[PDB]
RNA sequence: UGGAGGUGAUUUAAAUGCCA
């Protein structure tokens, strides 16, 4: 079929509202809480993360409130390709 | 040969740079 990072293991999905900066990414997840993410040492070179962008993140189990870690960003090729299959519906990005 | 002072002048606008 295809190779995409689905929710496999303990991943999350991350769509930020506004970046406070300095690494911390502020995401409006549908988990319920306001979450704040940080970046590992491999992806601060080739890519670009902005508000209006959907990515997959990975949390740590602490406090289930403010978690997340960037492990993969989504391209203009797959962001809306993950729509018809309904793995995410876009009613949680503007309303 | 090579130096130390002084007096004059010197012209539109013209910002910023992943990451091994
Ligand atoms: Mg001038």
Curated annotation (Swiss-Prot):
Residues 1-75 form the S1-like domain. GO terms for molecular function: RNA binding; translation initiation factor activity. Coiled coil: none annotated. Disulfide bonds: none annotated. Transmembrane segments: none annotated. The keyword Protein biosynthesis applies. Keywords: Initiation factor, Protein biosynthesis. The keyword Protein biosynthesis applies. It comes from the Archaea. Seems to be required for maximal rate of protein biosynthesis. Enhances ribosome dissociation into subunits and stabilizes the binding of the initiator Met-tRNA(I) to 40 S ribosomal subunits. Belongs to the eIF-1A family. This is Translation initiation factor 1A. It comes from Pyrococcus abyssi (strain GE5 / Orsay).
């Amino acid at each position: 079929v295809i190779r995409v990072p689905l929710p496999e293991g303990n991943q999350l999905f991350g769509v930020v509202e506004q970046a406070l900066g300095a690494g911390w990414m502020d995401v409006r997840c549908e988990d319920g809480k306001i979450r704040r993410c940080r970046i590992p040492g491999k992806l601060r070179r080739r890519v670009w993360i902005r508000v209006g962008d959907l990515v997959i993140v990975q949390p740590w189990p602490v406090q289930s409130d403010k978690r997340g870690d960037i492990v993969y960003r989504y391209t203009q090729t797959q962001v809306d390709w993950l729509l018809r299959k309904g793995k995410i519906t876009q009613e949680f990005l503007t309303g």
